[PDB]
Amino acid sequence: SPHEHQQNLLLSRIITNVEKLNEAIMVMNKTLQEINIQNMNIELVAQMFKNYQSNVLFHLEATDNLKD
């Protein structure tokens, strides 16, 4: 019985920490979701310069390349 009271009280502070933790995590995921939208643009441009480098390399190798 007294042990149970102690356990219930510790469980109460536990549950409060649980809810606070998860609320912060909700904010975390929400933040990342909003961020995500501001990343696809950059990703596209990254792949654009990537394939640019790839294709220009292939063509330079085709012509008189001037590498090492």
Give residues in contact with another protein (CB under 8 A). Answer: 51, 54-55, 58-59, 61-63
Minimal CA–CA distance to 30: which of 22, 18, 20, 42? 22
In the complex with another protein, the residue whose CB is nearer, 17 or 47, is 47
Residue 43 CB, shortest distance to another protein, in Å, is 17
For residues 56 and 6, what is the distance between their CA atoms, to the nearest angstrom?
A: 71
Transcribe 31-59 into DSSP letters.
Answer: HHHHHHHTTHHHHHHHHHHHHHHHHHHHH
Residue 63 CB, shortest distance to another protein, in Å, is 7
In the complex with another protein, the residue whose CB is nearer, 10 or 52, is 52
In the complex with another protein, the residue whose CB is nearer, 6 or 55, is 55
